Amino acid sequence: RIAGFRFSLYPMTDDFISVIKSALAATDTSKVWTKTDHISTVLRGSIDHVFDAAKAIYLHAANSEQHIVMNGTFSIGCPGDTQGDTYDKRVNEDAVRGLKAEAPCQFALYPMNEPDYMGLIMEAVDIAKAQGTFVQGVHYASELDGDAHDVFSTLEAVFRMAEQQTNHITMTVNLSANSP
Amino acid sequence: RIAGFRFSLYPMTDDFISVIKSALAATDTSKVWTKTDHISTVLRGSIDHVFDAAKAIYLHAANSEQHIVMNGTFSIGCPGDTQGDTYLDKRVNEDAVRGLKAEAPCQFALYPMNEPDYMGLIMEAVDIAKAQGTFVQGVHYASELDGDAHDVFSTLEAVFRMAEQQTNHITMTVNLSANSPSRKNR
Ligand SMILES: [Ca+2]
């Protein structure tokens, strides 16, 4: 039951190559299997290590002070998922404990082959409301805001709630830092 | 049965504000309802008008010659969807962009909702892309396409129509990359 995150980092700056390279390099990526291509990067591992890596990459990118966006898809349970392309402690948490970044976010939860999917989606919104990160609903997505630590905590709570109930789920996120 | 596309345009350039503004302004947006916020824009309308608009926006952005990416989600049929936020047949951009070209390497994922046969629809999607010559390979969590934008958007619309004819609520994510500096050009 391997978790994955396929994401892209978008630096709105002439210095984009360096910004991406630095954010990935600055992160402790030792607990996730990674593959980068010219469109995106995929991370695979436990839920814990995938979310820990994803937050750290965002915080390092945001702390470039450039306008950057992280847009990706979390997935777990996909039918036929390989047992390979993988290799506890949130290895980045201490290192980034003093970093902050605002993380306004649009996200969408996709519980697959699930008759009660709209209910799982409503529970996701309820979790965001309880945690203080929910802003509003929009067409095709919900909106979160707050600091990255809180927004990533909400996103993980939602994903965990859903993956406990339904075999295959995905969840898109679109998180914007230093927006003009 | 209104179709939608929530998308972001990411120009990897200091001039990003101007690039996004131009791409949206250059497009004939007369047949889609739009709403833009600081993260994304949503288009709503007919399948035809939404895809016509999406392709044009991509083509105009790419012809800025800057590295730009379009990332978004097409959606149709969500339970309880409003009958509002649309406008009440021709692909209005088709002719204006008929001479534009742009590489469209793409990762995409189809999500047929509340559908026991979804993995089968996804396989049908791969079959369409192969049939049209745009399929490259499967990757974790997505399929890859490549070709010119007119070809890639054609594959994407075909996949979308195939799925929406079979299941009530579908979504489909797309990530299209133009002018990547790592791409080898002849
Ligand atoms: Ca216009």
CATH no. for B101-186: 3.30.70.930
Q: What is the distance between the alpha carbons of residues B151 and B156, in angstroms, rounded to a whole number? A: 9
Residues A129-133: contacts with CB under 8 Å, at least 24 apart: A131/A157
Distances (CA, A) of A145 to A8, A148, A160, B117: 20, 8, 19, 36
Q: Enumerate the known binding-site residues of B for thiamine.
A: 9, 41
Going through A37-165 in order, the beta strands assigned E by DSSP cover 41-45, 68-76, 105-111, 134-138, 141-144
Question: In the sheet that B3-11 helps form, which strands lie side by side, from edge to edge?
Answer: B33-36, B41-45, B3-11, B68-76, B170-178, B106-112, B142-145, B135-139
Residue of chain A minimizing CA distance to B184 = A38
Name the residue among B72, B105, B73 with its Cα closest to residue B176.
B105
Determine phi and psi for B104, rounding to 5 degrees. -135, 55
Name the residue among A8, A62, A14 with its Cα closest to residue B13.
A14
Experimental method: X-ray
Distances (CA, A) of A77 to A83, A112, B81, B121, B131: 11, 9, 28, 18, 29
Domain positions in chain A are 1-79, 100-180
CATH no. for A1-79: 3.30.70.930
Q: What is the distance between the alpha carbons of residues B182 and A148, in angstroms, rounded to a whole number? A: 30
Q: Enumerate the known binding-site residues of B.
A: 9, 41
Nearest CB to A38 within list B39, B71, B182: B182
- The residue assigned the tokens 């295959």 is A168
Name the residue among B59, B134, B105, B7 with its Cα closest to residue A38.
B105
Find how far residue A62's CA is from the centre of its chain. Answer: 14
Taking each helix axis from N to C terminus, what angle separates A148-165 and A47-62, rounded to the nearest 10 degrees?
160
Identical topology for domains B1-79 and B101-186: yes
Q: What is the distance between the alpha carbons of residues B125 and B136, in angstroms, rounded to a whole number? A: 13
- Resolution in angstroms comes to 1.6
Beta bridge partners of B74: B5, B172
Topology given in CATH for the domain delimited by A100-180: Alpha-Beta Plaits (3.30.70)
Q: What is the DSSP letter of A147?
A: B
Residue of chain B minimizing CA distance to A80 = B119
Q: What is the distance between the alpha carbons of residues B68 and B13, in angstroms, rounded to a whole number? A: 9
Residues in B closer than 8 angstroms to A69, CB to CB, are 8, 10, 39
Name the residue among B177, B55, B146, B101 with its Cα closest to residue A16.
B177
